[PDB]
Swiss-Prot record, chain B:
One of its GO terms (cellular component) is viral portal complex. Its main location: virion. Homododecamer. Interacts with the terminase large subunit; this interaction allows the packaging of viral DNA. Interacts (via C-terminus) with the head-to-tail adapter protein gp4; this interaction participates in the head completion. Interacts with the scaffolding protein; this interaction initiates procapsid assembly, thereby ensuring incorporation of only one portal ring per capsid. Interacts with the capsid protein. One of its GO terms (biological process) is viral DNA genome packaging. The keyword Transcription does not apply. This is Portal protein. The gene is 1. Forms the portal vertex of the capsid. This portal plays critical roles in head assembly, genome packaging, neck/tail attachment, and genome ejection. Procapsid assembly may initiate with a nucleation complex composed of portal and scaffolding proteins. The portal protein multimerizes as a single ring-shaped homododecamer arranged around a central channel. Switches upon genome packaging from an asymmetrical conformation in the procapsid (PC-portal) to a symmetrical ring in the mature capsid (MV-portal). This change of conformation may serve as a signal for headful packaging.
């Protein structure tokens, strides 16, 4: 290898300068209007999952050139952020093939995209867990387009 | 390229997971006291901590804790490793000293560092001296009655004995010329 | 344990810990109990995380298997500690190989299966007499022994369902389960993984 | 989420001053569950980019440190140092410094006392400043005023 | 600039960089504290600068 040290250096450099959202009030807004939402954002996006997702996206952007996240809503009965609910940022691995953005979107943030498809690859036990979580029939095994290939002879 | 930075941040995330698991285990087996700072009587007793702990002794055998859902009041973070809380506080005071110029807060921080100094009686003299200085300044709250005696001595020494010089001389002039008024 | 995990992460790329509860009669940390962080050697082959976990800290994993390699006297020590039958020699998948011609290699190996389930539980709402109108919340699963005693001094205001995770450990072999679903104190799997160049390439973990 | 709205009010004959109330409106459905109440005045914050912080206290501490780096050693420097001691860490090893900073800031009058012990500290500061700290040369020259007015009265 | 407050803050910082440590320097420092960020951690300094 002569390229891998470069990738490691770039990943380390990008990790030494963490970035997060910083909400600020409007021009005519109150001088303290943005504090509560900013505090709740710090509350939700302080666990390990958010940092790991950001790091995965950064590494894929360095290597593959594309990365993605996903914000989902969940109910937390003990220590909730607000309204007995919390927001977490779980990672998406191989966002190039596991995230299918709209082909008509002409923006980097994909805000023009009017639809998006996310392909989930899970083991069998993961399939029963998914079916139980979303109230699905675990007996009917699903099928979809294979995002990944079998070029490497995986067992 | 430190080179071990990404390997350092991965270890930091591992430490955060360890802290989360430890917090869960503590809330499940350990006894976690709850601070119930109260102001009983007609505003007396001020704001003082009580560190209330609730335990139940089963008639059959053993005891099982009592912890409320207000347990996740602390969020895990990453910091330097310390052997005990005293070392952590000492490091805090040293960092603050490095972050403070040589003013009155510098003396305050130096005395507070002397407060949390090591066990040997070789520095017991300076531990007692720092305690006395902080208490006489009134910043510290005396717990043992000898510290209250030191505070009382400081109050007596400051009030009356340390009369301002020029202010009192000019008050002398005030009295004298008021007498000139009385005598016309 | 931390140094072992660091060395393995530098060399192999993966390391792990284990947080265990124990009873200490003299000088306990709290409630006549202490918590220690035992090390795990060769975490690549001795800790088998869930394949559906997509996080570096393995918090998404709902189960984990730890394989123990111990000598004979270690086997009787383990059986005495966990109240097992030392006569029945356990067996499990060999985490290690015999590529190097070691004069002897360990034979007695047993595995402990960690699993965590997130289910809503019944929690009783109580009124602490000392604090005064504190709407104290306690879980029934923990104080089912002292419900009656707590009623002797506390007031049960109401009932509520609170969702929490419980960790169960089950000592297993390839032929039978010696211990089944022993409740673990923690709310998460005690094994703490340490990774290096972690990532997913084709839905397969590569570190 | 539940987003409280600042409803700072000046009820009574100008009393209560400008104080925040952080009004939150929630409806508990008779059937089951609750539904939030949020007005269209929700987009009062614009997203920006800043360094990542674990909590709002760390963000405020970084703000105060940056301001210290941007302020010379004057009265605002002492004000910033005391405010930094206000937002110090959790340990009781710095509890004495936190209390000292609170007392100093309240005695200077910049801070608004909330708990009645802080109000007592403010009262003691007012009594100490008024009357006890008589200006020296000003009082002497007022003495001269009185004495020579007496010279007037006696001709 | 993202907003008008940021533009005014940059103006004040540049003018501070163009002013010696006199009375205008204190005036500019107080005006910079006037247009400081949203968090209530600096609410005390905002109020103090307004009062001054």
């Amino acid at each position: 290898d002569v390229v891998r040290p470069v990738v490691r250096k770039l990943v380390s450099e990008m990790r030494q300068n963490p970035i997060d959202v910083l909400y600020r009030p409007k021009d005519g807004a109150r001088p303290d209007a943005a504090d509560v939402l900013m505090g709740m954002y710090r509350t939700d996006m302080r666990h390990n999952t958010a940092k790991i997702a950001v790091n995965i996206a950064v590494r894929e952007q360095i290597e593959a050139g594309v990365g993605a996240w996903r914000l989902v809503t969940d109910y937390e009965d003990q220590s909730p952020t607000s309204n007995n609910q919390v927001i977490r940022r779980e990672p998406i691995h191989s966002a190039c093939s596991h995230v299918i953005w709209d082909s008509n979107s002409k923006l980097m943030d994909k805000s023009d995209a009017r639809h998006c498809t996310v392909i989930h690859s899970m083991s069998q036990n993961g399939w029963e867990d998914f079916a139980e979580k979303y109230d699905l029939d675990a007996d009917d095994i699903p099928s979809f387009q294979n995002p990944n290939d079998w070029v490497f002879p995986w067992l | 390229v430190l080179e071990t930075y990404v390997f350092q941040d991965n270890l930091a995330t591992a430490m955060r997971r360890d802290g989360e698991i430890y917090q869960s285990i503590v809330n499940d087996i350990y006894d976690v006291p709850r601070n119930v700072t109260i102001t009983l009587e007609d505003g007396s007793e001020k704001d003082v901590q009580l560190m209330a702990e609730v335990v139940d002794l089963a008639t059959g055998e053993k005891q099982v804790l009592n912890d409320i859902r207000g347990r996740y009041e602390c969020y895990t973070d990453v910091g330097p490793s310390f052997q005990s809380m005293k070392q952590q506080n000492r490091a805090e005071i040293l960092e603050l000293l490095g972050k403070t110029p040589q003013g009155t807060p510098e003396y305050q921080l130096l005395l507070l560092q002397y407060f949390t100094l090591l066990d040997g009686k070789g520095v017991e003299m300076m531990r007692d001296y720092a305690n006395k200085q902080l208490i006489q300044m009134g910043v510290k709250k005396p717990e043992t009655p000898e510290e209250q005696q030191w505070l009382v001595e400081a109050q007596q020494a400051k009030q009356g004995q340390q009369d301002p010089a020029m202010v009192q001389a000019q008050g002398v002039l005030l009295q004298g010329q008021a007498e000139l008024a009385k005598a016309q | 344990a931390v140094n072992i995990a660091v060395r393995e992460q530098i060399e192999a790329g993966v390391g792990a810990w284990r947080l265990v509860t124990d009873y200490e009669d003299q000088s306990p940390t709290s409630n006549n109990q202490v918590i220690r962080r035992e090390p795990i050697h060769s975490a690549c082959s001795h800790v088998i995380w869930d394949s559906n976990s997509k996080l570096m800290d393995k918090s998404d994993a709902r189960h984990c298997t730890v394989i123990h390699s111990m000598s004979q006297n270690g086997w009787e020590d383990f059986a005495e500690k966990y109240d097992l039958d030392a006569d029945d020699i356990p067996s499990f998948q060999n985490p290690n190989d015999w590529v190097f011609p070691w004069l002897t290699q360990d034979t007695i190996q047993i595995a402990e299966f960690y699993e965590v389930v997130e289910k809503k539980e019944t929690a009783f709402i109580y009124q602490d007499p000392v604090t005064g109108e504190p709407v104290s919340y306690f879980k029934r699963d923990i104080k089912d022994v002292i419900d009656d005693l707590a009623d002797s001094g506390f007031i049960k205001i109401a009932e509520r369902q609170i969702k929490r995770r419980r960790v169960y450990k089950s000592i297993i072999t390839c032929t039978a389960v010696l211990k089944d679903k022993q409740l673990i104190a923690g709310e998460h799997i005690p094994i703490v993984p340490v990774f290096g160049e972690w990532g997913f390439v084709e839905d397969k973990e590569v570190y």
